[PDB]
Ligand SMILES: [Zn+2]
Ligand SMILES: [Zn+2]
Ligand SMILES: [Zn+2]
């Protein structure tokens with residue numbers, strides 16, 4: 001599943017919904033090919049690990065939404 005016809009020029013938006021240990025939240029958007037935008041989203045989560053703890057992801061909306069939670 002998650003069937004995808006790749007095109008170098010494809011343009012999509014990946015939405016990352018972040019939830020932190022204290023319940024605070026934020027959403028960040030990443031644009032580019034599906035693959036590159038997805039990589040950038042996870043890269044952002046990694047930059048936040050030092051201050052917010054390890055993260056866990058639950059993928060939604062056929063891959064266009066990444067619900068990421070930080071353990072603190
Ligand atoms: Zn699957
Ligand atoms: Zn094609
Ligand atoms: Zn198809």
Ligand SMILES: [Zn+2]
Nearest residue numbers: 006007034035
């Ligand atoms: Zn693609």
Ligand SMILES: [Zn+2]
Nearest residue numbers: 006007008033
């Ligand atoms: Zn490509």
Ligand SMILES: [Zn+2]
Nearest residue numbers: 049050051052
């Ligand atoms: Zn710090």
